[PDB]
Every structure is written in structure tokens, then in C-alpha cells.
């Protein structure tokens, strides 16, 4: 076999339709059977892509024989490429996957993979003379070992894909083939695109009936998930948008229920040629479809196009087969729909009529795109630096620009709202999808807000006029004022800006003021600035952390002492009402700037849902907005926005009368050796959540659990919870808590079986049906722990424990130093070899370590020196 050298092509220039033709209806194939009539190089101009789709199953080697040396040169003729098609497997081995079978000739290793790479692109590319290489990423091409998914294979393929990017693509050693990607995933489930994206020349998504085009319905919430733009959204950060194809799917002769897509026309007796007609379809709205943002969609594609003019049936309509049967295509519809997308306002060429000024045009085409349908869509940054602009003009055209940059425009002699984009002040999205929509759906409903270009201004060494009255711009940022020095004329009225005190926004202000006042203009209808209406925020801090009280009786607003104020974007606190009293007689050259309109209720931002959560010293939790500093404790305040119920915007320190140090729950995630309860349940008993909706329950009415801290410290207090408001009486009414003697570890080769049965010593014992139990604890320093809790119900009273708290301070050895002590009391309890002043001398260095336990600042290194004291002396 002699293959033809590729004939010479014109570069592609969208849009583009793109064909999935099957191997198995070429008329060189197997025509005794499926199909004698069909060939794939009759294939229209209008194809831009044919893309070979084969059964792998079988040779049709006269249809390759056919392919390289007589479709392949009338298609390029025509300007059509020519695209192999293999599935994700081929880049990964086993299970079906083609060359990459031969593992011992391809190894999985760094160069095996290389060389598989190489294989596969002369096996499928080169050895016929194709124009590109498509990996279609889906179920049905998921790499498999004996029908089971490899994880192995999906991280190989993911490593050959690349080496094939560098052989072929934008980015390989041969970019007249094209690299393609075809898949059924969202990114976020796209294993191949983040490392694969930089590597491809398009991407395709097969998106078939009505959930490729509405999406996947979300039947709790009533929405839409998986649509056309969240699909685009989702891959926007990986490609371009002239990178993106959809694709609709013409009828396979004899599919089965899922593959009934209705993407054509359904059958009519009545027009034997409904299908062929492309009005109303899918596939004419997926060519209409154009994405609200980044810019216009790069074409569609068609799979089975092979059956191009074939009609869908519907099934609980009439049984007849008639459609099965195979025919020949004009490819009436593929034609179609290739002109629907070029006599479209979306793919019409930007051209004299929208930007006469032509520098500021070829600055147009390069940084949005050729089109107009990217004027209206595009989402980035234009930056002009060309000094050899005449006039901005069109600019007017650009709705949902990100960032304007107008650097050394020398000759540009005014702005205003007519050379400046229609988003520097607020609009909303005024393109309507083309898509049909869920029908019981509650998303979308209204317009959407097109946030507003960002306005750099710098070296217009010729700019006299600027008017950006009623934009409502937050800020002025971006314009050096310090080189617009022919300013003569400046207007910046009705916007949210803060122009006072040192605002950078006032530094720019008055640089132009000099400048337009050097010229003689000062005059009010020159320069003018008033009606702002500065936006309030919540401040990015609060200052005041701690707040000092005596020990009185009154009932303390935390909220009005501790949680206030309103920020603006160029940085004005005004925590006082007053303040912005002062803030709207702030001045200009003598004139208001801040609009008389608006009043405190407007700027300020309300704290009125925020909520409140005070721990105090024992590490107990009230909800309330206002404290008693009846009696003396210190407390630690935090408070919670609406939009985040579990990360504090402000932390304080209350200290009423003299500090007490912050106890800690020693026992949070502590690990559960023992007991008789539920084991994923009894974890939950410290969780450091006290709602455990989780089902916090334990046993059949009477439990008990053993369990170790973490990190054993000097326990000084307890309180456990009982289900919430969620029960009634099934409240806990007796509870044992025990603690361990440490030396009567029996075998500490185990640690359940020694414990479970062994000597435990009882701390403290509990009675009531109280809703939240606490309780100090006279010192304690044990490791393991044993809780008893008990409902008082009958067999089959299911007790629960939501939480329990073993409270204390972490002091490092602390039964040692509890052990000593012991060994102190102890000594000095008798008088033998004890001199009555040598005792003396001990029984204070003894109540000098119970003191330093006892202080309520606990000081870890002073009690560990009155350890170390009162242990050598133990030592004698
Ligand atoms: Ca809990």
C-alpha cells in the first residue's frame, strides 16, 4: 500500500461541524451484510472534521485500503480532516486496548509509556495519513482489567495522553495533526483533561437528548445540575471557548431504551422527509447555543452521521421497524446545520462598521476575538497601550469586559459612557439561552448581574475631559491622576466613592483638582463630585478583644461593647452614628460629597440575626446576648455571622474580677478502649458536638464506657449532656465516673482485658434529671477513664450520651505530681525521723504545690518546680 502525501490545506476557521462516521457503513466494509450503499468520502464540504469510528472487533482491511489512498484526498480536497477515533483503554492496556496490549513491548514505566505513545500515534495516525488522533473519554472506554476498572489504567492513561501531546498538537513535535478530546464527564469528573487540557487542539462534550441539553435534574432540591453552561463553566478553566464542540446524535439503526435521544426529528408518514429538515431540533439549537460568558462555542458535531436523513421513531407510538432499515445519506441535515452556524449574529466578523479606529481594532481582534458574539461575551482583560489610537469608539460594544486598561493614549481627548464599556455601570445578562428548559425547575428565573469592568487610566498625556457620572463605581483605583495632565473638565458624580480624610480615592481626587484648577477651571460645572453613596461593609477586624469588669450586679450588652461598625472599601470606620454626622459634612474645596439622600439606616450594616457564644472559665456555653457579672469568672466570646454558623468574625476576652485561666476538654476524640456500648456511637461522646443529631445513643438502657485522653492532663471539673430538647425523660438519671490508680496496669501488654476487670476509683457519682450536669472534681490525673450512665427505664430504654467533658488543664505527668503529693501527705502525716519544724518545713512546701494546683491562673511551670521540690525531698 502507497498512502498519498497529505494534500495542502487552509488553517480551520470556525465554526465547525464536526461527524462521527462508523466504519462498519462504509460500502468497503462488510456490504453483503450492514451496508452496501453509504461511503465515507462522500462526506459533504460542509464536514469539517470526519472523525473514523471503527469496530474494533473486526479488519475491513479494504476499507483502510479505501480510507488512505482514495477518502482521505478527496476529503482534504474538500478542506474536510480526517480524525481517528480510539477508546480511553488504547492509552492505558488490558481489557481491550488495542497496541497498548503488548505489555511486555510497552511496559508501565516512564519510557514504556513514552514508547507507547509513539505506537499509538503511527498505528492510528501516521500509517494511514490521518490529520489527528481523538481519545473519547466515557463508560464505555474506561480502562478495565477481567471487566473491573483499573485505577492503575486510568493513572497510566493519564501519562500516555501527555506523551502523546508532545508528539502531535499545539504542543507537539508535529502540530499539523490534531490532538482531540471526546467525553461524557463534567471536568470535576474528567480524570484526563487538568494535566491533558494544555495538550488539545478541541474538546468535545457528547451531550445527546434531553439531559445533555437541560441537564440532570435534581428531584430533592427542583433544580437542574450538569447544564450546558455549568458543563461549560466546568471546563472553561481548562480550554477556550473556541476550543468547545457539543454534540447531538442522529438515530442508530436499532438502539435500545438510553440510547433514544430524539436529537432529529421524530417520524411522520405524512413528510417522508421530516428528517433531513433540522428546524426545531436539537441540533439546530445546540448550533444556535452560544455560552453566556469567555465567548462563542467553536462548532457541534454529530455522532452515527452515517445516518444523516434518518427519521427517530417513538416507542409507545407505532411498533414498525421501517427506520432500522439502512439507506443512503445526502447529509441534508449536516449541511443544514454548518450554515445555521455561519449565517449566525454570533460568528459575523468585528470589521470597520463597530471599531473605525483600526490600531484600537487589531488590539480588539488579538485580546477578545474575530467575532461579535465575543463583544457580548468575552470576560477578560483588554488592555490599549498602541499610543497610535485616534478615537475609542465601539468600546460602547464590549458588555461583560473584566479589566480595561487605557495606557499612554495620548491622543485620546475625552471619556465618557460612548467609548467606555456598557459595564462600567450595573446591568444584567441580555442574552437569552436558545436551550429548552426543565419544566418543573425553580434555578435561573431572573437576569444575571455582569459584574463591572475595572477601569485602569494611565498616561493620557491628553485627556481634558472625564466623565463617569451615575456608575456607581466603588472606587477610583487604577487611574494614576498624577499623569493626565491635560485634565480640564472632570465629573465622578452620583458613585459609591468615599473621597475623604487620607482615601487613596481623595489623593486622586485632588490631583486632578490641581490640575484642572492650574488650568483655570475650578468653576463647579468643571470638576464636579457630589450624591456618593458610599457602600458600608463589615470591618475586615475588631479591635477591642478584652474588656476588664468588676464584680457588681448588672446585665452587660456584649454585643453593643464588643460588636460594631461599618467600614467602606477605601477604609472609614464609623462604629458611632455620629460619626457619619461628620462623615456627610466631610468637604471639597468647600461643597458635600456624600449625597443627602442617605442616612445612617442605609450605610450602616445591621448585626440584627448575627448570634453570640460565650465560654466561660469551666468551658460551659450559654447563647445569650447580655451577661451577669453577678459573680466572677472569665469568659471567651465569640460571634457568628448568618453565613457561616461555625467560624467566628470576632473573638473577645471578658474578664470579670480577677482572670481565671481558659480550662480545656481533655476528653475531646478521646479513644474508646473499652466498655459495653456502641463503639461508633460511644465516639460520638467526644466529638465536641453536644446536638449530635448523629444518634448519640449508647446500649439498651444502662451503659458504660472506658476510654483514654489523648493527652493526659490535671482534671479539675466534668459536666455531661442528655439529648437536647430530643427526649423527655429518657434523660440520664444516674452516672458513675471512675478513674484509674495508674500502677495496677495488671499486664500492659493489654489494656482492655486488664481494665475491664480491675480496681477503679470512683470521682464522683450523680443522681437527678437535670438537663446538663457539671460538677468541679477535687484535682485527678488519670489517663483512663470509665463512665456509668443509666435512665432508670426498663429493658429496652435505649440511654443515650450525647456529650461528656472531662475538663481540666494539660499538665504533662500529672498523676506523678498527684503521686508525689500522695507521698507527701503521706510523710507528713507521721512524725518519725521528722524533726517539728523540719515537717513545718515540708508541710509547706506540700500546701505550696496544692496551692499552685489550686491557683486558678494555673502556672504549669511553677507547679512542676513545687513537684520538683517536693519530690527530692521524698527522695531523703
Ligand atoms: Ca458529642
Known amino acids: 500500500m502507497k498512502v498519498p502525501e497529505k494534500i495542502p490545506m487552509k488553517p480551520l476557521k470556525g465554526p465547525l461541524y464536526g461527524g462521527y462516521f462508523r466504519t462498519w457503513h462504509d460500502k468497503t466494509s462488510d456490504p453483503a451484510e450492514k451496508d452496501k450503499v453509504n461511503s465515507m468520502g462522500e462526506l459533504p464540504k460542509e464536514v469539517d472534521l470526519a472523525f473514523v469510528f471503527h469496530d474494533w472487533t473486526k479488519d475491513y482491511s479494504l476499507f483502510w485500503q479505501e480510507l488512505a489512498t482514495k477518502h482521505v484526498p478527496t476529503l482534504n480536497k474538500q478542506g474536510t480532516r480526517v480524525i481517528r477515533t480510539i477508546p480511553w483503554r488504547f492509552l492505558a492496556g488490558g481489557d481491550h486496548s488495542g497496541i497498548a496490549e503488548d505489555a511486555q513491548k510497552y511496559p508501565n514505566t516512564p519510557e514504556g509509556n513514552k514508547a507507547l505513545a509513539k505506537a499509538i500515534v503511527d498505528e492510528y495516525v501516521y500509517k494511514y495519513n490521518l490529520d489527528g488522533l481523538d481519545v473519547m473519554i466515557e463508560r464505555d472506554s474506561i480502562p478495565k482489567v477481567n471487566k473491573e476498572e483499573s485505577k492503575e489504567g486510568i493513572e497510566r492513561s493519564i501519562q500516555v495522553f501527555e506523551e502523546i501531546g508532545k508528539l502531535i498538537g499545539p504542543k507537539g513535535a508535529d502540530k499539523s495533526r490534531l490532538f482531540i478530546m471526546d467525553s461524557t464527564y463534567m471536568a470535576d469528573k474528567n480524570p484526563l483533561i487538568e494535566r491533558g487540557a494544555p495538550y488539545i487542539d478541541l474538546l468535545l462534550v457528547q451531550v445527546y437528548g434531553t439531559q445533555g441539553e437541560k441537564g440532570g435534574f435534581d428531584n430533592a432540591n427542583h433544580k437542574a445540575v450538569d447544564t450546558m453552561e455549568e458543563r461549560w463553566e466546568s471546563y472553561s478553566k481548562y480550554i477556550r471557548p473556541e476550543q468547545y464542540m457539543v454534540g447531538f446524535s442522529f438515530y442508530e439503526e436499532k438502539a435500545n431504551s438510553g440510547n433514544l435521544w430524539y436529537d432529529v426529528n421524530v417520524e411522520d408518514d405524512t413528510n417522508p422527509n421530516i428528517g433531513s429538515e433540522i428546524k426545531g431540533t436539537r441540533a439546530e439549537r445546540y448550533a444556535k447555543w452560544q455560552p453566556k460568558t469567555g465567548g462563542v462555542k467553536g462548532g457541534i458535531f454529530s455522532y ?363 476528653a475531646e476524640g478521646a479513644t474508646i478502649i473499652g466498655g459495653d456500648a456502641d463503639p461508633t456511637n460511644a465516639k460520638k461522646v467526644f466529638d465536641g458536638l453536644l446536638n449530635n443529631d448523629t444518634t448519640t445513643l449508647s446500649t439498651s438502657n444502662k451503659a458504660s464506657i472506658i476510654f483514654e485522653l489523648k493527652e493526659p492532663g490535671l482534671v479539675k471539673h466534668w459536666r455531661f449532656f442528655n439529648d437536647s430538647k430530643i427526649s423527655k425523660a429518657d434523660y440520664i438519671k444516674e452516672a458513675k465516673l471512675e478513674a484509674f490508680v495508674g500502677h495496677l496496669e495488671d499486664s500492659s501488654k493489654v489494656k482492655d482485658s486488664l481494665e475491664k476487670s480491675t480496681e477503679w476509683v470512683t470521682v464522683s457519682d450523680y443522681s437527678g434529671e437535670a438537663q446538663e450536669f457539671s460538677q468541679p472534681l477535687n484535682n485527678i490525673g488519670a489517663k483512663y477513664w470509665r463512665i456509668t450512665i443509666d435512665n432508670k427505664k426498663s429493658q429496652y430504654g435505649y440511654v443515650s450520651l450525647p456529650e461528656l467533658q472531662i475538663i481540666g488543664h494539660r499538665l504533662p505527668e500529672a498523676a506523678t505530681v498527684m503521686t508525689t503529693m500522695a507521698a507527701a501527705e503521706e510523710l507528713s502525716q507521721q512524725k518519725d525521723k521528722f524533726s517539728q519544724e523540719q515537717l513545718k518545713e515540708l508541710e509547706v512546701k506540700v500546701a505550696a504545690l496544692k496551692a499552685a494546683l489550686d491557683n486558678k491562673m494555673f502556672n504549669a511551670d511553677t507547679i512542676n518546680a513545687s513537684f520538683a521540690d517536693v519530690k527530692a525531698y521524698i527522695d531523703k
Open 304 to 666: 452515527g452521521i452515517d445516518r444523516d436523513g434518518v427519521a427517530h421513531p417513538k416507542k409507545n407510538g407505532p411498533k414498525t421497524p421501517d427506520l432500522d432499515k439502512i439507506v443512503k445519506s445526502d447529509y441534508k441535515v449536516s449541511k443544514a446545520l454548518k450554515k445555521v452556524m455561519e449565517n449566525d449574529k454570533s460568528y459575523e466578523l468585528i470589521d470597520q462598521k463597530d471599531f473605525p479606529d483600526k490600531a484600537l481594532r487589531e488590539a480588539v481582534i488579538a485580546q477578545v476575538g474575530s467575532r461579535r458574539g465575543n463583544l457580548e461575551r468575552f470576560n477578560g482583560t483588554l488592555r490599549l497601550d498602541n499610543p497610535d489610537i485616534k478615537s475609542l469608539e465601539g468600546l460602547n460594544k464590549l458588555k461583560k469586559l473584566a479589566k480595561l486598561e487605557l495606557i499612554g493614549l495620548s491622543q485620546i481627548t475625552k471619556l465618557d459612557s460612548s467609548v467606555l464599556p456598557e459595564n462600567i455601570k450595573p446591568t444584567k445578562d441580555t442574552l437569552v439561552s436558545v436551550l429548552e428548559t426543565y419544566k418543573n425547575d425553580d434555578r435561573k428565573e431572573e437576569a444575571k448581574a455582569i459584574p463591572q469592568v475595572a477601569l485602569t487610566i494611565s498616561g493620557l498625556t491628553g485627556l481634558k475631559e472625564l466623565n463617569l457620572a451615575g456608575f456607581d463605581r466603588d472606587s477610583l483605583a487604577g487611574i494614576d491622576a498624577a499623569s493626565l495632565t491635560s485634565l480640564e473638565k472632570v465629573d465622578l458624580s452620583s458613585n459609591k466613592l468615599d473621597l475623604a480624610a487620607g482615601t487613596e480615592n481623595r489623593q486622586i481626587l485632588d490631583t486632578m483638582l490641581a490640575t484642572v484648577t492650574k488650568h483655570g477651571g475650578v468653576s463647579e460645572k468643571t470638576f464636579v463630585f457630589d450624591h456618593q453613596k458610599p457602600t458600608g461593609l463589615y470591618p475586615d477586624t475588631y479591635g477591642t478583644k478584652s474588656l476588664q469588669l468588676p464584680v457588681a450586679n448588672d446585665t452587660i450588652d456584649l454585643q453593643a461593647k464588643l460588636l460594631f461598625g461599618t467600614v467602606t472599601n477605601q477604609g472609614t470606620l464609623i462604629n458611632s452614628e455620629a460619626d457619619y454626622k461628620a462623615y456627610q459634612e466631610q468637604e471639597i474645596a468647600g461643597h458635600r460629597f456624600v449625597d443627602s439622600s442617605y442616612d445612617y439606616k442605609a450605610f450602616a450594616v445591621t448585626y440584627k440575626d448575627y448570634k453570640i457564644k460565650v465560654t466561660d472559665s469551666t468551658l460551659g456555653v450559654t447563647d445569650h446576648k447580655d451577661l451577669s457579672t453577678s459573680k466572677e469568672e472569665t469568659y471567651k466570646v465569640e460571634f457568628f455571622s448568618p453565613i457561616n454558623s461555625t467560624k467566628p468574625v470576632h473573638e473577645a476576652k471578658i474578664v470579670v474580677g480577677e482572670e481565671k485561666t481558659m480550662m480545656v476538654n481533655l
